[PDB]
Amino acid sequence: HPKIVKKHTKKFKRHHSDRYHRVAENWRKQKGIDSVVRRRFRGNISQPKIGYGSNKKTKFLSPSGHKTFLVANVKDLETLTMHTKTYAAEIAHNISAKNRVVILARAKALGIKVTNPKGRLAL
Amino acid sequence: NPAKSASARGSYLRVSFKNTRETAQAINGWELTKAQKYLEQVLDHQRAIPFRRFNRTAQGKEKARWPAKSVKFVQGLLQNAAANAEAKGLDATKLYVSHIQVNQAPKESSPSHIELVVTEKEEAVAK
Amino acid sequence: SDEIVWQVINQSFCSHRIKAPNGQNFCRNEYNVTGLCTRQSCPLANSKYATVKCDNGKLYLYMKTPERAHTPAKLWERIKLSKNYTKALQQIDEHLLHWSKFFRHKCKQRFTKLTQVMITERRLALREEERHYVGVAPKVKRREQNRERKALVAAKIEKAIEKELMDRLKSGA
Amino acid sequence: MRLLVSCVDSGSIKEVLCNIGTDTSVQSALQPFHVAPHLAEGLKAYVDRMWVISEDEAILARNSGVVELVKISKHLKPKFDISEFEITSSVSDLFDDAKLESLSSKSVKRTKLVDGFVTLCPIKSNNTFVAATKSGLLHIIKKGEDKKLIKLASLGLKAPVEFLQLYDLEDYIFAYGGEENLIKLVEIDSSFQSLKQIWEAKNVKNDRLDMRVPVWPMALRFLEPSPGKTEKGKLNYQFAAITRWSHLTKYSTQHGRKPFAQIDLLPNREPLSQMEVFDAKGENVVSSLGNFQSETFNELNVITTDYKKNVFKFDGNGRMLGKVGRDDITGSSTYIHVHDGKYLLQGGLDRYVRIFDIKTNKMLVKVYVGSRINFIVMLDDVEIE
Amino acid sequence: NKLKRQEIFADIKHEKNKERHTMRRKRAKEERENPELREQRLKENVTQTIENTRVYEDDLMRYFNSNSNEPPKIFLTTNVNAKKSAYEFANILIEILPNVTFVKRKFGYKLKEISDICIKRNFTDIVIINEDKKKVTGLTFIHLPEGPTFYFKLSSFVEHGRPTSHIPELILNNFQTRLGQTVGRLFQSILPQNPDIEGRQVITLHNQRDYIFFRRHRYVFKDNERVGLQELGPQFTLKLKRLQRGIKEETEWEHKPEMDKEKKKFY
Amino acid sequence: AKQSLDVSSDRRKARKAYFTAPSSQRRVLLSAPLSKELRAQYGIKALPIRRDDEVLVVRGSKKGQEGKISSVYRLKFAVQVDKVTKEKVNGASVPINLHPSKLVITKLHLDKDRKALIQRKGGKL
RNA sequence: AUAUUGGCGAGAGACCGAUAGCGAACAGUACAGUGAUGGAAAGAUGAAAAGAACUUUGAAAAGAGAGUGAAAAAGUACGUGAAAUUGUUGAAAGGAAGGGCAUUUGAUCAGACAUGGUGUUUUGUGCCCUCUGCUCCUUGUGGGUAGGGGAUCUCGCAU
RNA sequence: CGUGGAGGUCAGUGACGAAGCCUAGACCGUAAGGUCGGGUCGAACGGCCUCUAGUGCAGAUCUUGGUGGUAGUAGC
């Protein structure tokens, strides 16, 4: 597949997200006109913009080359039979370990890659 | 290792938090008998408890004070720990205060919780 | 009609659609060759359809025609696929004679994928995997962790070892 | 009541004398009157099979390849009595481990497969008994006028042999089988000097994965001949068997060689064995040997034990009726046998002798014997005053 | 009312503590003059610890365990797709087990095949460590003849002295129960059976309720008829499991999660 | 579904009524089903329980236990069964509180009022 | 026929959820004002108290053992326990710190129970060959299911 | 993008552990955020098309509640 070129691997952080504890790390655009970040002066944190857009041919593809697809039960898992190479089955965090083994068995039978196998399981 | 250590805790005491912390720091890591002797001497004003954080005499060479009120509770807790170790059948000579901590208690005066742990030193080892 | 049904299922909440994070609308319907809810692929949006499904080890070529739309109880007919791969492909091609190339290609791909899914038999034949997946409940984990610590504290292994050594060498040297 | 327990570890017969409600696990609970070993030979020559000819004379078989006739005597010792055992005659050298050793390869998993007595029951009034072994050797032993055992013939069956069951329902025919060995019906000549293979079972069609269904019948029990239509060429026999792979198979010779129905008793083909016919209400609907006195499978109810801990109850359609000793059996039940239709003898690796009530599954007796249990027989159900 | 409930019980506890302290002081003071009364009171008051409230063959040993007449060769391997932690644990296994041979898992030789090969090589026991994450979680031991085996869960694995080349002395504790002494016999037949007391090396197994603690120490005696000991490195605790009684057939005691409710009987 | 306009299906109102129900209503609340053997005898499904009534335990850790009842704790909505008691660390025995809905009556206590109630409820004796 | 924020008694809400909702879910109570008046804070233990028997250090606070309990990481300060803040262990660094571009070092985390696919050669099987049947529609380029005979057999499977 | 509630659908998820919280763990997106790996927790919550609003905080000498330097200082 085409190379997965990540234009910006570093997570964007809100200005002063570390100077004050009351400011969440979630990005928020500065509204003040005098704000240096809004004017993107040299040396300031990078501002998200249209330039960092990832290419469609590699968008949403994990480093393993398989797209993530949440799976809730065997019925959902069976839908990836025709897209095993392009899609991978991801078990939801709320799935009890009782059904996790059954889901993993079906995934192995169909050859569907599992993004987070063995979760909550013990050998 | 619980099999080689004993614990003693005092909660909701009315001693000053800063003085209690200074006393605990001045006594952390000392031997049980040596720590008790040092506290007794402090009660006699022969030695002073250094105040390194919450604050000039010759006794401070080893900026010091004699917090008798806090020292009384500290020595009481040390005696309780020694009694616990004796109940556990530990060697009092090898006992040394390996952990001591002061925590601010609910509010007025500033009460605090004091807990300490004593552990037996490892010795008598040979091929 | 198909156009009205197609547009209603597309823009009016088809019940069996799944939205992946990538932005692809999936289709978990059992009667579809492809799990994508696009046109000419969803069985509900097309009067004529063909698909491969299996209940027992045998594989069956499922197809429907407007002759049975009015009677859903007899909507889909099936024929044994002659599980010999070379014979099965030609049988599928003959059955789908004059059908849209899309349907023939999708049916052949589905049949090939289902046939190669027999790897389950290979793993079943190569059984005796001793890992024996086991699930650990949070309540079970709590019991072992705390009770093991309590047992260790109460055991006093050092004292027992000392007592045994003293009792052993009293008349053992 | 009085029971005889076979102890593999000690290789001795243990006489258990206790009343209903005995429990050795509780000090305050009723305790057995007497529990002592008899005829100890060690784990090398432990008893393998036991049959009670009468309350005074019994015949025992050992894994060493020797069948010993045991004389039972009584002496008094509150006011109850205990029994003593004396061996009068025996026959040895019946085992042939070479056949089993040659079949060790390609087996699922096991050791050299030392031979052992699979079945021991009278052939017929005539004091004639048939001895079967895993090696396939079928020996005939008769009690002479002098009470000394004499060997009359040494027949040979297709090894490996896991079970043997005679057809006592007259209304000599017996069936046998083993690992990768389809069930075969055998007719014995009146002189016991020959055997005829009249009928052989056939495997069922392959599963979804097209894999051949393995054949491993662990036990078999005969039913009455099928009524109504009786086509010639085919035979008239009805029986059911339980396989290791948890498949409950019912056979009807009139229908054909292949079983007419197969039901999966447990998922993942759980190891199952010890198929004993029992009545849901405790009626003695089983013949002297254990065959079901009925001509229909709907009334058939069977008790089977898995190899981990459980004792399962199944009907004629494979439906699980419940469990016996679910909260008390901590190990595999090596031996289970319905006695008088109401008492269920239980024993295994847990070293506890248990007697369960078929009517209610209640644990009636619990006696600790220390050694592992492989065979249990009850002599009398009378309660000591 | 929360305030009323909190205030009422807060004062009640203070009064209860005051009464308890006063009663204890008076009892001690009066017992000082009457020592026998203290003894009678102690006899009349049992601490009711959990231990005190517990709720109630030579041929076998030789046949299902190793004996001094022939040293036991123990086959050591690891579950397929093993990693560094497994080999690190195998290093300690080599350091502690008498005669070990390490063989990489071939991924396809069935357990029957492994047993047959070991019989061909006259091996005595098979030990295999299994891992899920980068940590040891369970250990197994199987005897070749007649296939008596035990499976053990592994927890609290911790890596201070350097053991000498001497064979540590074997000591077992709290194996009175019939099931317990079977694991005790397994340990006595799997670990070295020839002590070399010179060098003061000891290996101890100590079960309390269901977990067995394995540790090594150096022991030195003094004139006070007491022996001091020092930790000799690794900490180890194990839990018996599945009690197969065969290679994989006829399990006898396999543990179930439904147990442990009784809080006693310390299987 | 409820059709009467005089009955409300409000959860809050029902919860308030249940907790604030008087002892007279709680007597009806604390009903216990009769054993299948007794149901055929008296031809009745359930009747209010009382002291001398003998009941069997069908649920809880004490399943399979039986004994004569000794008290009907209407305030706590619980009833006590003789020989079904807890063992404290100090040795004191405290009866375990059980709900009548989880117990089966094995032997009723017969009085004139109980006999009249049995006839009223379509039973027989 | 019309109004109805008071009274009694009922049926409901696309309403709010202990800093909301009436000020009051446990109050017009405590409390302040000579007074008319103002006017709060506060819900949840645990299935059940089974509320820590008992030993042991403390004039007293409560501690250490011990046990009850699914859990005490639920102990009447009790459904769950984050920040601001405070004390200890460890790492780092030193009239300041904070953020951005690129990287070394230290610590540390992931890193396939993947073990395959293809053509060939023995042997045993079936849905495979042959004979004899039963069963559903409609009628059709079908489906389901039985009893006798073998390895012409790679049509699939297992070796 | 996200939240309170409602109509519909997933014969959805869940005591073999739902929500919340923590996490020098990882994945996805330009981001509002979603998802998964590990610890406490216990009983409800969510994938999607619409409707609905007391729907999103960095300050308003902002309100309630909580905690620091000042300070063991002035002082008693």
C158 and B4 within 8 Å at the Cβ level: the answer is yes
Bridge partners of residue D185, in order along the sequence: D175, D199
- Tokens in use for D363? 């644990």
Distance separating alpha carbons of residues E250 and F6, to the nearest angstrom? 66
Distance separating alpha carbons of residues F46 and F49, to the nearest angstrom? 9
Residue C8 lies in a domain: yes
Domain count for chain D: 1
For residue C60, what are the CA distances in angstroms to C87, C107, E85?
A: 14, 11, 50
Q: What value, to the nearest 5°, has the Cα angle with vertex E150 and ends E149 and E154?
A: 145
B126 contact residues in E (CB cutoff 8 A): 200, 218, 220
The answer to whether the beta carbons of residues E124 and E97 sit under 8 Å apart is no
> What does residue C61 show for φ and ψ, rounded to 5 degrees?
-90, 105
Q: Give the total residue count for chain D.
A: 385
C131 contact residues in A (CB cutoff 8 A): 123
C157 and B3 within 8 Å at the Cβ level: the answer is yes
Going by the DSSP 8-state scheme, the letter that residue C60 receives in this structure is: E
The answer to whether the beta carbons of residues D1 and D20 sit under 8 Å apart is yes
Distance separating alpha carbons of residues B21 and B102, to the nearest angstrom? 6
CATH at F68: 2.30.30.30
A59 and C22 within 8 Å at the Cβ level: the answer is yes
- Tokens in use for D319? 């439906």
Distance separating alpha carbons of residues E216 and E201, to the nearest angstrom? 7
3-state SS assignment for residue C169: helix
The answer to whether the beta carbons of residues D378 and D3 sit under 8 Å apart is yes
H or E segment to which residue C101 belongs: helix C101-116
The answer to whether the beta carbons of residues C58 and C82 sit under 8 Å apart is no
3-state SS assignment for residue A68: strand
The answer to whether the beta carbons of residues D66 and D90 sit under 8 Å apart is yes
- Tokens in use for E59? 């041929």
C131 contact residues in E (CB cutoff 8 A): 79, 130
Distance separating alpha carbons of residues E37 and E27, to the nearest angstrom? 10
Strand G contact at CB of residue D234, distance < 7 A: yes
Distance separating alpha carbons of residues C144 and C138, to the nearest angstrom? 10
Distance separating alpha carbons of residues F70 and F87, to the nearest angstrom? 18
Relative to beta strand B64-65, strand B49-50 is antiparallel
CB-nearest to B122 from E164, E200, E230 is E230
Distance separating alpha carbons of residues D252 and D265, to the nearest angstrom? 20
CA distance D326 to chain C (A): 21
Which residues 17-56 of F interface with strand G at a CB distance below 7 A?
none
- Tokens in use for E42? 């102690």
> Could you tell me which of A110, A81, A90 has the C-alpha nearest to residue C34?
A81
3-state SS assignment for residue E85: helix
Distance separating alpha carbons of residues B80 and B32, to the nearest angstrom? 12
* Nucleotides in chain H with any atom closer than 7 Å to protein CB: 7-19, 27-42, 47-49, 58-59, 67-68, 71-73
Distance separating alpha carbons of residues F125 and F114, to the nearest angstrom? 11
Asked if F touches B (at least 3 Cβ pairs < 8 angstroms), the answer reads no
* CA E55 distance to own-chain centroid: 21
The answer to whether the beta carbons of residues D364 and D356 sit under 8 Å apart is yes
Task: Please state how this structure was obtained.
Answer: cryo-EM
Relative to beta strand D261-264, strand D272-277 is unpaired
Q: What is the rounded end-to-end Cα distance, in angstroms, of chain E?
A: 47
What is the domain extent for residue C62?
A: 1-126
Distance separating alpha carbons of residues D279 and B77, to the nearest angstrom? 73
For residue F82, what are the CA distances in angstroms to E114, F48, F56?
A: 61, 18, 11
Residue F13 CA distance to nucleotide G13 C1' (Å): 15
Tell me the resolution in Å.
3.3
The answer to whether the beta carbons of residues E120 and E144 sit under 8 Å apart is no
E112-131 burial code (b ≥16 CB/10 A, e <16): bebbeebeeeebbbbbbbbb
Distance separating alpha carbons of residues C31 and D286, to the nearest angstrom? 52
For residue C70, how many other CB atoms are within 10 A of its CB? 8
Residue D320 CA distance to nucleotide H14 C1' (Å): 28
Bridge partners of residue D51, in order along the sequence: D59
CATH at C16: 3.30.390.110
Distance separating alpha carbons of residues F31 and F35, to the nearest angstrom? 13
> Could you tell me which of D371, D385, D369 has the C-alpha nearest to residue D3?
D369
The residue assigned the tokens 């009842």 is F69
Domain residue ranges in chain A: 2-123
Bridge partners of residue D337, in order along the sequence: D345
3-state SS assignment for residue F61: coil
Which residues 98-157 of C interface with strand H at a CB distance below 7 A?
135, 137-139, 141-142
Distance separating alpha carbons of residues E151 and D205, to the nearest angstrom? 38
* CA E190 distance to own-chain centroid: 14
A100 contact residues in E (CB cutoff 8 A): none
Distance separating alpha carbons of residues B78 and D281, to the nearest angstrom? 73
Q: Give the total residue count for chain A.
A: 123
Going by the DSSP 8-state scheme, the letter that residue C36 receives in this structure is: B
CB-nearest to D207 from C57, C118, C125 is C57
The answer to whether the beta carbons of residues D277 and D292 sit under 8 Å apart is yes
The answer to whether the beta carbons of residues D144 and D164 sit under 8 Å apart is no
> Could you tell me which of B11, B2, B16, B12 has the C-alpha nearest to residue B65?
B16
Domain count for chain C: 1
Residue C153 lies in a domain: no
Relative to beta strand B95-104, strand B112-120 is antiparallel
A100 and C135 within 8 Å at the Cβ level: the answer is yes
As a dihedral over the C-alpha atoms of residue A94, residue A99, residue A100, residue A101, rounded to 10 degrees, the angle is 170
- Tokens in use for E84? 């560094």
Q: Give the total residue count for chain F.
A: 125
DSSP of A76-94, one letter per residue?
HHGGGGGGTTTEEEEE-TT
Question: Burial of F109 by CB count in 10 Å (0-12 exposed, 13-18 middle, 19+ buried)?
Answer: middle
The answer to whether the beta carbons of residues E151 and E138 sit under 8 Å apart is yes
DSSP of chain E, one letter per residue?
-HHHHHHHHHHHHHHHHHHHHHHHHHHHHHHHH-HHHHHHHHHH-----TGGG----HHHHHHHS-BTTBPPPEEEEE-SS--HHHHHHHHHHHHHSSSEEE----SS--HHHHHHHHHHTT--EEEEEEESSSSEEEEEEEESTT--EEEEEEEEEE------SSPPEEEEES--SHHHHHHHHHHHHHS------TT-EEEEEEESSSEEEEEEEEEEE-TTS-EEEEE-S-EEEEEEE---SSSSS--SS---TT-SSS--S--
Distance separating alpha carbons of residues E133 and E154, to the nearest angstrom? 13
- Tokens in use for D342? 């109401």
Residue F49 CA distance to nucleotide G9 C1' (Å): 33
Distance separating alpha carbons of residues D43 and F28, to the nearest angstrom? 66
> Could you tell me which of D294, D288, D4, D271 has the C-alpha nearest to residue D125?
D288
Bridge partners of residue D36, in order along the sequence: D15
> Could you tell me which of E97, E91, E88 has the C-alpha nearest to residue E124?
E97
Asked if E touches D (at least 3 Cβ pairs < 8 angstroms), the answer reads yes
Domain residue ranges in chain B: 1-127
C57 contact residues in D (CB cutoff 8 A): 206-210
Beta strand segments in D224-324, E: 238-243, 247-252, 261-264, 272-277, 301-306, 311-315, 320-323
Bridge partners of residue E203, in order along the sequence: E170, E216
Bridge partners of residue D305, in order along the sequence: D273, D311
* Other chains touching C, judged by 3 or more CB pairs under 8 Å: A, B, D, E
H or E segment to which residue F29 belongs: helix F23-29
CB contact C154 to E (< 8 Å): yes
Domain count for chain F: 1
Q: Give the total residue count for chain E.
A: 267
* CA F60 distance to own-chain centroid: 15
DSSP of C103-157, one letter per residue?
HHHHHHHHHHHHHHTTHHHHHHHT---TT--EE--HHHHHHHHHHHHHHHHHH-H
Residue C107 lies in a domain: yes
Distance separating alpha carbons of residues B12 and B112, to the nearest angstrom? 6
Which residues 55-74 of B interface with strand H at a CB distance below 7 A?
55
> What does residue F110 show for φ and ψ, rounded to 5 degrees?
-100, 120
Distance separating alpha carbons of residues D61 and E160, to the nearest angstrom? 59
Strand G contact at CB of residue A65, distance < 7 A: no
Residue C61 lies in a domain: yes
What is the domain extent for residue F90?
A: 1-125
Give strand letter and number of the nucleotide nearest F5 (CA to C1'): G11
Distance separating alpha carbons of residues C44 and E96, to the nearest angstrom? 69
* CA B122 distance to own-chain centroid: 21
Residue C172 lies in a domain: no
The residue assigned the tokens 């040997």 is D289
- Tokens in use for A5? 């070129």
- Tokens in use for D259? 């079983």
For residue A100, what are the CA distances in angstroms to A119, E256, F82?
A: 8, 21, 47
H or E segment to which residue D163 belongs: strand D163-166
**Domains of chain E with bracketed CATH:** 57-261 (3.40.50.10480)
3-state SS assignment for residue D354: strand
DSSP of C70-99, one letter per residue?
T-GGG--EEEE--SSHHHHHHHHHHHTTTS
D208 and C57 within 8 Å at the Cβ level: the answer is yes
